[PDB]
Ligand binder design. Structure first.
Ligand SMILES: *[C@H](O)[C@H](C[C@@H]1CCNC1=O)NC(=O)[C@H](CC(C)C)NC(=O)OC[C@@H]1CCC(=O)N1C[C@H]1C[C@@H]2CC[C@H]1C2
Ligand SMILES: *[C@H](O)[C@H](C[C@@H]1CCNC1=O)NC(=O)[C@H](CC(C)C)NC(=O)OC[C@@H]1CCC(=O)N1C[C@H]1C[C@@H]2CC[C@H]1C2
Lengths: 300, 303
């Protein structure tokens, strides 16, 4: 079988806390002696339409921030703002702090989300950064400050902090330096994203995953050039495939004995002819939120 | 595009219980709770024992000092051993300080749970599985994954419901509860075993229809009702599972949230089965989903 798999979330769970300012509560990430959270925690309903964050923050004091790790209050002893993230210095270090880094991910890359409410972890699932810099998440009221991450060996690479939902039901947020992915702004307004596209390299990775699991009805005897494939891909609002993507797909190509451009010809046929009512790995749609690495990590 | 997705429970409380158990060169995963480690009993088998193992005889030949239990690289001393159905229980000299509040539960077909896939006692990934009506799961398990567990978390309490033992020829997976009783008719022997023909999980399809209604997608509701028995007889003709009383009860919260009586929703589903969807969609799809339970729907709709 082959399904969406998230990283084990324990190393991140040990970092989640609750942050309250006024009548607003959301989550924070407690690493060493600093708690990171969305800066919109400081806004009232009046502030949120056009918040002058520097002006709002200078009017706050350390004691206006209530931070709770379970049934224990952490005293804030300083604060600062970096882009759209607030950094609350506390007087206590988190002994559960994992080895970690902050990274900014590229569109098409995947990560695990630990959805949290009131500082308590509630669910974990895999997401991709969409080409239009939204994420198709599952986030409800109170989920802000939930984070996205990848794990490599013992090191947690944090790449996402949650801030908002758009009218279409997708989500937007920042890296851990507080810079948004995409053209979004932390104000209380209805915001549209640019047109999304499908992550072609990931669809191909998943077609290879299907073949590995014995699904091969969509294969064909034909091939395509890279440029001819890309012309069709663009027509169907799929991202271009680069030579780097072809290279990245090498190990899957070698495992299955199917050249990348041969799989591209299969995908072209699927775009032009549809799935004829069949499914691939149980799905009626082409899946684009597995990277080549995700397929390899899982299949071996 | 439906707004719903498979969501696992946070795995940290289970990560803190995973160990490795080795007998000879065979290593699998175990679950360390208080001063007991639970694992599949086939750890005591050699390749040759596996076709027709005599587990009672194999266990009598073992002693405490034949079991290597490790949390990471740190050995945990075994002070007793016993077999309960298809699980081995190793008493150890240290109570796991990370033991959560826990219970052992035996789930019903249709129920979902989170799997923490582990190798050599180290977790690799977490994902949601549904117990199919034929008592198999569609996991992602490789060599070395045995002893990985399935669980749900309710408030503080981890309910362990699955321990992994084997892969069937069709690529689906079989295992036990934490008392070592297999789900389904399967046995822990390296023989060819077949799953029964699978069926659609009706209670979960009904949960999905309720989810659609909650989201304002309700074209399929009709003015009619059915008895439970009439519905079940029709359902079987479409390879859908019959509903049990427990299924009716677990749909209670969604029925109350929407005001649509369970048997009225059954009549709507019956019409969909008999007439098809006629080019229409529900929650964006022409296919009905059967791996979200009523609990999963409430979690994703209401938090
Ligand atoms: C933080 O916990 C929270 C998370 C979202 C709540 C629901 N799901 C989420 O992901 N974030 C916020 O409340 C945002 C704070 C802003 C950035 C200061 N706002 C937000 O996400 O707003 C979402 C709502 C629902 C969809 C939508 O378009 N929208 C914006 C408001 C503004 C206009 C009035 C009502 C709608 C349009
Ligand atoms: C424990 O880690 C391991 C997990 C499985 C390995 C492959 N994927 C898994 O999930 N379980 C076992 O090794 C089982 C031990 C038995 C229960 C004593 N055996 C097992 O899972 O066997 C799977 C293999 C591969 C697919 C298949 O059909 N099969 C069974 C054997 C038995 C007969 C010989 C060859 C086939 C038929």
């Amino acid at each position: 079988g082959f399904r969406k798999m998230a990283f084990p979330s324990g190393k991140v769970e040990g970092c989640m806390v609750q942050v309250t300012c006024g009548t607003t509560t959301l989550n924070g990430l407690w690493l060493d002696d600093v708690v990171y959270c969305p800066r919109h925690v400081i806004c009232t309903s009046e502030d949120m339409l056009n918040p002058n964050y520097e002006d709002l923050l200078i009017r706050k004091s350390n004691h206006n921030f209530l931070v709770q790790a379970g049934n224990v209050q952490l005293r804030v002893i300083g604060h600062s703002m970096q882009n759209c993230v607030l950094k609350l210095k506390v007087d206590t270090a988190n002994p559960k702090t994992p080895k970690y880094k902050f990274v900014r991910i590229q569109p098409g890359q995947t990560f695990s989300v630990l959805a949290c409410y009131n500082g308590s972890p509630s669910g974990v699932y895999q997401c991709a950064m969409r080409p239009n810099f939204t994420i198709k998440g599952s986030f409800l009221n109170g989920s802000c400050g939930s984070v996205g991450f990848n794990i490599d060996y013992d090191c947690v690479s944090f790449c996402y902090m949650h801030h908002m939902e758009l009218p279409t039901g997708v989500h937007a947020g920042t890296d851990l330096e507080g810079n948004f992915y995409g053209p979004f702004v932390d104000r209380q307004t209805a915001q549209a994203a640019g047109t999304d596209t499908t992550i072609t390299v990931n669809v191909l990775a998943w077609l290879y995953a299907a073949v590995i699991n014995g699904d091969r009805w969509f294969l064909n005897r034909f091939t395509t050039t890279l440029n001819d494939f890309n012309l069709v891909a663009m027509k169907y609002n799929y991202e271009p495939l680069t030579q780097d993507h072809v290279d990245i797909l090498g190990p899957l190509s070698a495992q299955t004995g199917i050249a990348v451009l041969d799989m591209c010809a299969s995908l072209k046929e699927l775009l032009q002819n549809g799935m004829n009512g069949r499914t691939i790995l149980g799905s009626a749609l082409l899946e684009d939120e597995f990277t080549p690495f995700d397929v390899v990590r899982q299949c071996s």
